[PDB]
Design an enzyme around this catalytic site. Sequence first.
Site: not given
Ligand SMILES: O=P(O)(O)CP(=O)(O)O[C@@H]1[C@@H](OP(=O)(O)O)[C@H](OP(=O)(O)CP(=O)(O)O)[C@H](OP(=O)(O)O)[C@H](OP(=O)(O)O)[C@H]1OP(=O)(O)O
Length: 134
Positions: A2, A11, A31-32, A42, A58, A61-62, A81
Site C-alpha cells: 500500500r 493512493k 465488490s468482493s 480500481g 488494476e 486484474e479486476e 475512507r
Molecule cells: O471489497 P472490495 O475491495 O471489492 C470493494 P470495497 O473496497 O468498496 O469494499 C468495501 C470494504 O472494503 P474492503 O473489502 O476491505 O476493500 C469495506 O471494508 P473496510 O473499508 O475494510 C471496513 P472493515 O475494516 O472491513 O470494517 C466495507 O465492507 P464491510 O466493512 O461492510 O465488510 C464496505 O462496505 P460498507 O460496510 O461500507 O457498506 C465495502 O464496500 P462495498 O464496495 O462492498 O459497498
Amino acid sequence: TRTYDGDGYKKRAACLCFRSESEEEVLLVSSSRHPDRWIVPGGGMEPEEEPSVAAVREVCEEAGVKGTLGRLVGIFENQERKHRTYVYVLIVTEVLEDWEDSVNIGRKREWFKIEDAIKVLQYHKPVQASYFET
Ligand SMILES: O=P(O)(O)CP(=O)(O)O[C@@H]1[C@@H](OP(=O)(O)O)[C@H](OP(=O)(O)CP(=O)(O)O)[C@H](OP(=O)(O)O)[C@H](OP(=O)(O)O)[C@H]1OP(=O)(O)O
C-alpha cells in the site's frame, strides 16, 4: 504494498472502461465484500508506480479487460475512507474470459449505460458516481 500521499490518504487509480469511443456504456465490477454491489474497477498504486500504469494494471486484474488509455479525468478524494484516486478513461479493445479476480474471488463484470452506472453507484459510492459528472 500500500502507498500513501503526504497527508496519509491511500493512493489509488481507477479507469472508466468504456465499450467504445462514444463513451455510452461503461464496465463496472462487483465488490468482493458485497457481490450484489457494483463499483468502478480500481485499487492501490504500488511504490514508484505511475498512476496511469496502476490504472491499466488494476482494470486487467479486476475487470479482465485491456484497451487504449485516454485522458486523466481528475483526482478524487473519498474523505470517509481517506482515499485519493486518479481516474482515467480507458476504451476497451480486449475482453479476456478467465481473469485474475474471476479465477481468485469470482468477481463479476457488467456493461452499464452511463446514466444507469451513475444510478447504481450513488448509494454506496457517491464519489465514484461523481467520476462521470464531467
Ligand atoms: O471489497 P472490495 O475491495 O471489492 C470493494 P470495497 O473496497 O468498496 O469494499 C468495501 C470494504 O472494503 P474492503 O473489502 O476491505 O476493500 C469495506 O471494508 P473496510 O473499508 O475494510 C471496513 P472493515 O475494516 O472491513 O470494517 C466495507 O465492507 P464491510 O466493512 O461492510 O465488510 C464496505 O462496505 P460498507 O460496510 O461500507 O457498506 C465495502 O464496500 P462495498 O464496495 O462492498 O459497498
